[PDB]
């Protein structure tokens, strides 16, 4: 039972929010969705919404994969945060906008001893109000394991390409 959603659904969620923590991962890089993501960040900020980026240490397929791609899109450095700086803020975050990330958020790291990723610190996106996952399918990330966060009522799956879906969200907003 996955709670699937559209671009217009994700538009309402974040339009009517105070604080939004963007969680980018490998899928954003593949789609090359950086400029649409930073453009989306501008329209949120335009109507008073607090925006910040949460870069997991192993996000992507190389150290600092998200940082170089976000620098290409001209996100300010003072909006970008490491895991230890920002993890506390998920409690006060209305939305965790998870764009092309998976293993970065997976609570099998903490809750599941038998998991291969057990012991790695993760971003606590589940503690946010609504978790938005952008990804093309129900396929797993690099570690090859399921994410239980997909199957819960505070989470919405947004099935599509990360560049196209983010562009669709920006058009659904004004």
């Amino acid at each position: 039972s996955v709670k699937a959603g559209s671009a217009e659904d994700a538009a309402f969620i974040m339009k009517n929010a105070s604080k939004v923590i963007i969680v980018p991962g490998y899928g954003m890089a593949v789609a090359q969705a950086q400029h649409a993501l930073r453009e989306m960040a501008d329209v949120l900020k335009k109507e008073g919404v607090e925006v910040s980026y949460a870069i997991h240490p192993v996000a992507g397929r190389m150290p600092g994969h998200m940082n170089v791609l976000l620098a290409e899109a001209n996100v300010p450095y003072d909006e970008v945060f490491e895991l230890e700086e920002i993890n506390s803020s998920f409690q006060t975050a209305d939305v965790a906008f998870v764009i092309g990330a998976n293993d970065v958020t997976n609570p099998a790291a903490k809750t599941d001893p038998s998991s291969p990723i057990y012991g790695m610190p993760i971003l606590d996106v589940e503690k946010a109000g609504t978790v938005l996952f952008i990804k093309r399918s129900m396929a797993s990330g690099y570690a090859g394991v399921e994410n239980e966060l997909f199957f819960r009522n505070n989470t919405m799956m947004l099935f599509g390409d990360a560049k196209k879906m983010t562009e669709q969200i920006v058009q659904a907003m004004n």
Binding site: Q32, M62, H65, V68, L69, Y118
Partner: protein, 380 residues
């Protein structure tokens, strides 16, 4: 319990396996941290900064490592077969943690075994998400990949980006990255962000998308073959002449246009694969440069020589050793963090003693010898 970090004695190596942040963490775990004087001078870490963090400064290497229940180090210790005897300075029944190069250097393992020293070869760390906090290959290759582009730009006589000026227009530098691991990927990123047109190639099928994820162009050679190229641990297999011929042919078209070729390809245990032949070097344009990060494993371009920039057929073939040491001030604290994250889960908070999880994949996969017996299956 005493932990010891010496100065790196090998030539060119300016790194150190310690930082001020990691000193106070080790002190918090209950260790007495000892460090040789001047060990962090090449990595911008003063003795006062280490003393302020809580460490003891020792006058010589022998005095730091006498006593010294754990030894943290960057490079492998110098054996007596290479003249100077570093393993002789280490205590009997002590723990050693460093890059050993164990698969290519069995004599240092045999030497470490003769003093009953428990040695963990950090380069045999499994390449999994959870081990990245404790992965010395990843943190050091990343900087080495970044360095290749800086060194390429330094040796190259044109500017990386396209420039449209009043005097006219000059084209961008054309970069080709052979081998798209951790280093290769950061080279693409650093070359791309400087404004160069970046091509790349690799044997592993996952790479193509990874190159495209940084706006680079992958050079395909035989996708029906790249399916089986990746081992269980993510490493490349030995590929065979049938593929190798087809790679050199397929890559030739771009390599004739390439200004800067950065080669990073490695195979665990084996010598590095020849990716740029001598004939290929003759066909590159004059003023071109090759950066050979695989030079210490024989080189991907085998005309390269360790510690030397050599000009051959008008192409400047670069082969610096200890490339992460060229970024020693960032490289060192990252290396120290890796060794801390490896060790921390095995420390007893109450009794202040080190008790290793022997069944842990991190520990079993990396352990080379213990109590005078070579444990790792690769060296048996």
């Amino acid at each position: 319990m005493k932990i010891a970090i010496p100065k790196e004695r090998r030539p060119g190596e300016d790194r150190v396996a310690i930082s001020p942040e990691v000193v106070k963490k080790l002190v918090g775990l209950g260790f007495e941290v000892i460090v040789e004087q001047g060990a962090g001078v090449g990595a911008s870490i003063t003795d006062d900064a280490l003393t302020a963090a809580g460490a003891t400064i020792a006058s010589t290497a022998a005095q730091a490592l006498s006593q010294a229940d754990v030894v943290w180090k960057v490079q492998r210790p110098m054996t007596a077969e290479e003249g100077t005897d570093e393993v002789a300075l280490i205590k009997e029944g002590a723990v050693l943690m460093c890059h050993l190069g164990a698969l290519t250097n069995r004599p240092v393992v045999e030497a470490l075994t003769k003093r009953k020293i428990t040695a963990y070869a950090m380069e045999l760390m499994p390449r999994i998400s959870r081990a990245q906090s404790m992965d010395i290959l990843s943190s050091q290759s990343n900087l080495a990949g970044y360095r290749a582009v800086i060194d390429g730009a330094y040796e190259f006589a044109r500017a990386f980006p396209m420039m449209m000026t009043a005097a006219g227009t000059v084209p961008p530098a054309r970069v080709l990255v052979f081998g798209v691991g951790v280093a290769g990927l950061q080279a693409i990123a650093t070359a791309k962000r400087l404004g160069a047109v970046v091509m790349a190639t690799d044997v592993r099928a996952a790479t193509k998308e990874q190159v495209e994820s940084l706006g680079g162009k992958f050079i395909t050679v035989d996708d029906e073959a790249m399916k089986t190229a990746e081992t269980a641990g993510g490493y490349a297999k030995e590929m065979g002449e049938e593929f190798r011929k087809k790679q050199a042919e397929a890559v030739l078209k771009e390599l004739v246009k390439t200004d800067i070729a950065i080669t990073t390809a490695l195979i665990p245990g084996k010598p590095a694969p020849v990716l740029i032949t001598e004939e290929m070097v003759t066909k590159m344009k004059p003023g071109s440069v090759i950066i050979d990060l695989a030079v210490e494993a024989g080189g991907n371009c085998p005309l390269s020589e360790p510690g030397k920039i050599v000009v051959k057929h008008g192409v400047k073939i670069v082969g610096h050793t200890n490339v992460p040491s060229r970024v020693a001030a960032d490289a060192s604290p990252l290396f120290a963090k890796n060794l801390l994250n490896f060790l921390t889960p095995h420390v007893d908070k109450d009794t202040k003693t080190l008790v290793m999880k022997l069944e842990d994949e991190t520990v079993s996969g990396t352990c080379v010898t213990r109590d005078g017996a070579i444990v790792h299956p690769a060296l048996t």
